[PDB]
């Protein structure tokens, strides 16, 4: 064989990411720390030199022609614009319904603000200012009363995570949702995306307990089949999922006895008390700076979880 | 009161070539470079069997000819070799200290020894799979004492 | 002989090595006195040993 | 220690380490040697796992056989050909009588 | 790979019954019992050692 | 980063073998070793779903969740170049699985060994005597309803093989013969005559469920007597305790076997190596998915 | 991407401490913080598993859950260097654990606080007044076995042969594991959740499967029916009297499976580790966080 | 070194064996004995034949 040809190929296969660098001064800004800190882009000008510099044509992960970095995966959807307001911000966690129709093509996605008026029919003032008609969403789930009275609603929703891009389509709306990966915007000026959650639904679980500092904290959503209708509380915590189910069991241990105290589960299925589903992790330190969401006539407080990473889990029953 | 260190001795790995060992007398070798693109091979023999014009009354066998074909079988071999992250990090850094320069030539010789283990393991695997090709196509001699 | 020791010392291989120790103790033990019975094969036998 | 009504035959098998001859005639097969191809396959924080591909193609340039293999000398009977009947309460574990 | 391990199957019966015209083909074996009502029970085989 | 695994066939293939294997060019299957060059004896589910042994879903599920999986990519006449799935990146799979369940995008997928019969998803190779069994890749709610309706048909076949007055063969066939999901109303294949004493698929798992439901009345009562009125209210008959009639080492053994047969069954109902698909596109039936 | 937790020690380290540390190189260490440099306080389970007579294994599980995990690879004077385990990267976990449970090929290990005695896994540092205790890394069928043994002891000692329950039975050599008398409040809370779950289980439970076992005990003796010793239970026989239907047990099974998945999620506490290419002779296991 | 394989087995990487060799020391001492009379004859001086 030939060691000479294989030396070139292994020399190409050599470099790991350069982890350590022994800097001497900070004001020099030399070439070595420049090559250390440079991140390769994901979009560039459609030309010769800009593409062959930014390197979109490298396989697997881009390089100028592993790092703890992977490109995101998308879920692209088609919806009526009568169920989705174009004036909503980018980072909202979307909730795709699975319709009982075999071939649809159009989806039934749900902003949780829009998803609030399905449950009911501050928070409700903005929810009725935004999506003014309960009927244009009560036909996306054409059988809601039989579906939630049989407690069969938690296995019917797939949380698809945060939106990234919403082209303002007129009749049939197209959104662009990241269902797994690092939530970044698909724009030519690249900005950050923050998963905005309404302040009413969001309840923090770390401050609800009121030691060991973790690196990443995870956001949850959790349907609860309460007596006054389904609610959609968003729990933020930093523990394992099997710890989260148990601490939610002890948290809703009043509410299980409340649901028994108001009605008796005459049929077997009524004992199923809600379900919980993860959405993904984020840094627990610099996370969920509060802010406000501005519509035309009113405003509601909103929770911007910065620098997300979406990773959906399944539906786990709490009872 | 000292402890004397007498010596560090290491073995020098000899290299064998396939065209050095005498197993290659029983084989024919060609460097077809892009052999993965060859999905199938085909040699074809034309054996025209003559016959004897008999005298008695028998079924006469006419002009016979045997077209027989043999297809190739590929053999894809692979070993593994590890290289740690520390000496690779030493490789991609630049030495400026005599201690780190000693670490640098140590890492360079480590990677060269790993590469030589790779090519030598591939050579031994080549002669191994040649031998196993031969043992797969070798009937035992208590059959060939009669079938030959 | 690595012909018994090529796949490593397992239980059965070491047991067969113990039995081969017994056999080489009973048969090929004293290579000079039992060579007297070979007569003319003495030089070849002792050269082989 | 009386005889039962049946008379079994026993079957055993005995592994015999032979050190065989191998003949293989001149120019039996033609070989194509490819190119070695190195490819990493793990990237962990301790050690990246290199692996090298190599592919060759052998094909026999004769129609009939060109290689044979006979056992020259018995190295040893590596088994001890004793009486170790395998117990049938182990090979068929789910079987049992009434009580 | 030339140190292959052959496998030979060995068999032997246990406790057969001889035909009724019993006989011997060598002398100097005198078992102190009835030779007509004699019956096998065992199989004294030889080991590797 | 390379993922090319080249299994190498001993004898090269016959023509209908290629004509079957090219029909499963997008299927996934368990690799026993995750290494660079393999042999065909280690490919998918041949040594655990062997026809000459009694199979079981527990050992197949354990082999499946234990070993790596690998999407098949290329099939030549002698080497089946296939790539393994790691949790680092995403892949493009195709649903060519003979009980056809119409997939949908952003639905959680699973891999299960074949329950609907061996001959649907298999390639009986006559070149080398090796039987590649391809596992069923079907979406998760469909799959767990399949497991429920197969287990129920199993125990219902057994209880009418015991006595014909227990269950009716039409009501067990109307309800458990069919699945319903998103309007797509598929039909299952029911093995009606599995033979007694098990000796087929899903007959220890039914016995697992049976020993678990048999020992739960002595388990919940033991646990509530080890600890009240709300727990002792919702059963009206099981609250009648008889625990002072049973010996404590006997109850210890029953609780141990109940705990093992509960944890095994409950990790088994969790659906194995669970895949996460984004956008199922049924114009080409390809589904972009990554390992979850 | 560098993962290296240089743990500076408060004072120096003795030679016998170096010898007891270099034995367990390649093992899992929890870390209270995740940052690049720490102190020896917070490291190991010592902050929850201090020198107390009563252990709280449920709180120790809750310690090991949210905290990061790390492999140890080097120790010198004043500095034992670890290496962080982040989800997504692969590591070499060495089986240098003192109750020598042998691992399977490419199975799944789950870390656990030491139930086999504190001093069996404890590196005493009298110099820096700290007891760096270590977790226990064991295969998952053994881990759920010791979890069910812990819970069975926790109910059977407070409700009453039990010392043989306390002995776990490995194939090579059996082990005895240290057992507390009280769990703390969280252990009893998990017991309330278990008793509630099991009461709903025996509410929703089907009936023709009982017709299977009652009809099968009297008909077939099996490897999974010898535990009854030819005796149908009382509750099963007096529940089995009624006639059957299929669609009702279809609903009963649709809630049984969802509740058993949550019941399995009760015992799945403690992290999980996906291993590959385990060696009996090199004692390494290529493993990444699951 | 090791051999690359075709079949799928868990390959050993590059191996390296480290073994050390100690030295054995040996003391030796016999007891030669000289009588005091010859010693005093040597330390003195002669004059007399």
Swiss-Prot record, chain A:
GO terms for molecular function: DNA binding. Structural component of the T=16 icosahedral capsid. The capsid is composed of pentamers and hexamers of major capsid protein/MCP, which are linked together by heterotrimers called triplexes. These triplexes are formed by a single molecule of triplex protein 1/TRX1 and two copies of triplex protein 2/TRX2. Additionally, TRX1 is required for efficient transport of TRX2 to the nucleus, which is the site of capsid assembly. It is found in: Virion; Host nucleus. It comes from Epstein-Barr virus (strain B95-8). This is Triplex capsid protein 1. The keyword Thylakoid does not apply. Its main location: virion. GO terms for biological process: viral capsid assembly. Disulfide bonds: none annotated. It comes from the Viruses. Belongs to the herpesviridae TRX1 protein family. GO terms for cellular component: host cell nucleus; viral capsid.
Swiss-Prot record, chain C:
It is found in: Virion; Host nucleus. Coiled coil: none annotated. Signal peptide: none annotated. Homomultimer. Makes the hexons and eleven out of twelve pentons. Interacts with triplex proteins 1/TRX1 and 2/TRX2; adjacent capsomers are linked together in groups of three by triplexes, heterotrimeric complexes composed of one molecule of TRX1 and two molecules of TRX2. Interacts with scaffold protein; this interaction allows efficient MCP transport to the host nucleus. Interacts with capsid vertex component 2/CVC2. Interacts with the small capsomere-interacting protein/SCP. Self-assembles to form an icosahedral capsid with a T=16 symmetry, about 200 nm in diameter, and consisting of 150 hexons and 12 pentons (total of 162 capsomers). Hexons form the edges and faces of the capsid and are each composed of six MCP molecules. In contrast, one penton is found at each of the 12 vertices. Eleven of the pentons are MCP pentamers, while the last vertex is occupied by the portal complex. Belongs to the herpesviridae major capsid protein family. This is Major capsid protein. It comes from Epstein-Barr virus (strain B95-8). The lineage of its organism: Viruses, Duplodnaviria, Heunggongvirae, Peploviricota, Herviviricetes. The gene is MCP. The chain holds residues 199 to 247 of 1381 of the full protein.
Curated annotation (Swiss-Prot), chain G:
The keyword Nucleotidyltransferase does not apply. Keywords: Capsid protein, Host nucleus, Virion. InterPro entries: Herpes_capsid_2. GO terms for cellular component: host cell nucleus; viral capsid. It holds the Pfam family Herpes_V23. GO terms for molecular function: structural molecule activity. It is found in: Virion; Host nucleus. Interacts with TRX1 and major capisd protein/MCP. Belongs to the herpesviridae TRX2 protein family. Structural component of the T=16 icosahedral capsid. The capsid is composed of pentamers and hexamers of major capsid protein/MCP, which are linked together by heterotrimers called triplexes. These triplexes are formed by a single molecule of triplex protein 1/TRX1 and two copies of triplex protein 2/TRX2. Additionally, TRX1 is required for efficient transport of TRX2 to the nucleus, which is the site of capsid assembly. This is Triplex capsid protein 2. It comes from Epstein-Barr virus (strain B95-8) (HHV-4). The gene is TRX2.
């Amino acid at each position: 064989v030939d060691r000479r040809r294989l030396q070139r190929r292994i020399a190409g296969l050599l470099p790991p990411p350069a982890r350590r660098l022994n800097i001497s001064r900070g004001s020099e800004f030399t070439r070595d720390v420049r090559g250390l800190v440079e991140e390769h882009a994901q979009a560039s000008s459609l030309s010769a030199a800009a593409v062959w510099r930014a390197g979109l044509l490298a396989p697997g992960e881009v390089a100028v022609a592993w790092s703890g970095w992977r490109p995101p995966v998308f879920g692209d959807f088609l919806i009526h614009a009568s169920s989705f307001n174009n004036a909503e911000a980018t980072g909202t966690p979307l909730f795709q319904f699975k319709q009982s129709d075999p071939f649809s093509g159009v989806d039934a996605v749900f902003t949780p603000l829009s998803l609030f008026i399905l449950m009911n029919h501050g928070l409700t003032r903005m929810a009725n200012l935004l999506y003014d008609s309960p009927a244009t969403l009560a036909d996306l789930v054409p059988d809601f009363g039989r579906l939630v009275a049989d407690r069969r609603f938690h296995n019917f929703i797939t949380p698809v995570g945060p939106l990234v891009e919403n082209i303002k389509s007129t009749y049939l709306n197209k959104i662009t949702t990241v269902v797994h990966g690092p939530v970044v915007s698909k724009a030519i000026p690249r900005s950050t995306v923050k998963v905005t959650v309404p302040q009413e639904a969001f309840v923090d679980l770390d401050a609800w307990l009121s030691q060991p500092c973790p690196a990443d904290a995870r956001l949850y959503v959790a349907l609860t089949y309460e007596e006054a209708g389904p609610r959609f509380t968003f729990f933020q915590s930093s523990r394992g999922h099997c710890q989260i189910m148990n601490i939610l069991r002890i948290y809703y241990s009043p509410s299980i006895m409340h649901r028994y105290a108001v009605v008796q589960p005459l049929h077997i299925e009524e004992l199923t008390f809600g379900a919980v589903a993860c959405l993904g992790t984020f840094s627990a330190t610099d996370g969920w700076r509060r802010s406000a969401f501005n519509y035309r006539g009113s405003s509601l407080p909103v929770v911007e979880i910065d620098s997300f990473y979406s990773n959906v889990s399944d539906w786990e029953v709490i009872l | 009161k000292f402890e004397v260190l007498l010596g560090v001795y290491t073995n020098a790995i000899q290299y064998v070539r396939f065209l050095e060992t005498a197993l290659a007398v029983s084989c024919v070798n060609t460097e077809f470079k892009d052999l993965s693109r060859m999905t199938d091979g085909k040699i074809q023999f034309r054996i025209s069997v003559p016959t004897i014009a008999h005298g008695d009354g028998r079924r006469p066998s006419k002009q016979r000819t045997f077209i027989v074909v043999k297809n190739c079988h590929k053999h894809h071999i692979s070993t593994e070799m590890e290289l740690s992250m520390l000496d690779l990090e030493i490789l991609h850094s630049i030495p400026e200290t005599p201690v780190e320069y000693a670490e640098y030539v140590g890492a360079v010789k480590t990677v060269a020894s790993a590469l030589q283990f790779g090519v030598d393991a591939l050579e031994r695997g080549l002669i191994n799979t040649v031998l196993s090709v031969k043992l797969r196509h070798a009937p035992p001699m208590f059959i060939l004492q009669t079938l030959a | 002989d690595p012909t018994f020791t090529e796949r490593g010392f397992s239980k059965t291989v070491k047991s067969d090595l113990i039995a081969m120790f017994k056999r080489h103790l009973l048969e090929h033990s004293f290579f000079l006195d039992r060579a007297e019975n070979m007569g003319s094969g003495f030089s070849q036998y002792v050269r082989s040993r | 220690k009386i005889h039962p009504g049946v008379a079994m035959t026993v079957v055993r098998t005995d592994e015999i380490l032979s050190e065989n001859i191998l003949f293989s005639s001149r120019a039996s097969t033609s070989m194509f040697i490819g190119t070695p191809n190195v490819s990493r396959r793990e990237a962990r924080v301790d050690a990246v796992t290199f692996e090298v591909h190599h592919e060759m193609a052998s094909i026999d340039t004769g129609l009939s056989y060109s290689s044979t293999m006979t056992p020259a000398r018995v190295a040893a009977i590596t088994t001890d050909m004793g009486i170790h009947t395998q117990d049938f309460f182990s090979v068929f574990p789910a079987e049992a009588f009434g009580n | 790979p030339l140190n292959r391990r052959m496998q030979y199957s060995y068999y032997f019966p246990v406790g057969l019954f001889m035909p009724n015209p019993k006989y011997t083909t060598s002398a100097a074996i005198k078992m102190l019992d009835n030779p007509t009502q004699q019956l096998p029970v065992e199989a004294w085989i030889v080991n590797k050692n | 980063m390379d993922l090319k695994v080249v299994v190498s066939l001993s004898s090269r293939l016959y023509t209908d073998e290629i004509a079957k294997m090219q029909q499963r060019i997008g299927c996934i299957l368990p690799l026993a070793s995750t290494h660079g060059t393999q042999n065909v004896q280690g490919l998918g589910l041949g040594q655990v779903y062997s026809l000459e042994t009694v199979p079981d879903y527990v050992s197949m599920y354990n082999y499946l969740s234990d070993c790596t999986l690998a999407v098949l990519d290329e099939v030549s006449v002698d080497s089946l170049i296939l790539t393994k799935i790691v949790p680092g990146q995403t892949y493009a799979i195709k649903n060519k699985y003979q009980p056809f369940f119409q997939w949908h995008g952003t639905g959680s997928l699973s891999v299960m060994p074949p329950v609907f019969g061996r001959e649907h998803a298999t390639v009986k190779l006559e070149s080398n005597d090796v039987d590649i069994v391809f596992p069923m890749v079907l979406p998760t709610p469909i799959a767990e309803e399949v497991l429920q309706k197969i287990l129920l048909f199993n125990v219902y076949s057994r209880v009418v093989m015991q006595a014909p007055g227990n269950a009716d063969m039409l009501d067990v066939h109307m309800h458990l013969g069919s699945v319903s999901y998103l309007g797509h109303h598929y039909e299952l294949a029911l093995p009606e005559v599995p033979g007694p004493l098990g000796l087929a698929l899903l007959d220890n798992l039914s016995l697992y469920f049976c020993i678990m439901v048999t020992l739960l009345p002595r388990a919940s009562m033991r646990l509530v007597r080890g600890l009240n009125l709300f727990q002792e209210m919702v059963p009206d008959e099981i609250a009648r305790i008889d625990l002072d009639d049973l010996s404590v080492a006997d109850d210890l053994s029953r609780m141990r076997v109940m705990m093992t047969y509960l944890q095994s069954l409950a990790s088994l109902f969790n659906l194995g190596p669970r895949l996460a698909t984004a956008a199922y596109s049924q114009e080409t039936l390809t589904a972009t998915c990554w390992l979850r």
